[PDB]
């Protein structure tokens, strides 16, 4: 994200979310977790397609 410097490899820079649903996500964390969540929705939509065909 453009709130970071270049060549930053630390946890928080690349998606580690020091916080818990109770404590609440930070802005950055919120976004990263969003990116992760999307990836989950995507292949759930893709799995059901794939397996629906396998079954047939």
């Amino acid at each position: 994200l453009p709130h970071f410097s270049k060549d930053d490899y630390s946890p928080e820079s690349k998606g580690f979310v020091e916080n818990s649903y109770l404590r609440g996500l930070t802005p950055q964390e919120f976004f990263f977790h969003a990116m992760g969540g999307r990836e989950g929705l995507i292949d759930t939509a893709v799995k059901t397609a794939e397996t629906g065909y396998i079954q047939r």
Binding site: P2, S5, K6, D7, D8
Partner: protein, 119 residues
Amino acid sequence: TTFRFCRDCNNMLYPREDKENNRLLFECRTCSYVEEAGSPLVYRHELITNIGETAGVVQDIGSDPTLPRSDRECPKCHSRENVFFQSQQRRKDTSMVLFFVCLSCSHIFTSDQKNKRTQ
């Protein structure tokens, strides 16, 4: 490597053998020109490389707000003012070494503790 061009045509100069005298001659095949070679080195490959590591390290590099700034001393401008980055040689098997620029004398130094370095 380094290779050269015709003085007249301005075309690529292809090497050829003297035979009789045992020396190496570049010649152009557009016109006729011919010169003696400066090095014996004709061709070179490099697979493990260095060039393109320090890459576009240029005066205004200080003004770039997206480069991080460390606390290192500099080997010559004993200043503590520097910007840094990883090898610009964007390739799967490059090291993770940092390169620093002494925002005071533009001296380029490295975080590396194994390798010799002449930039």
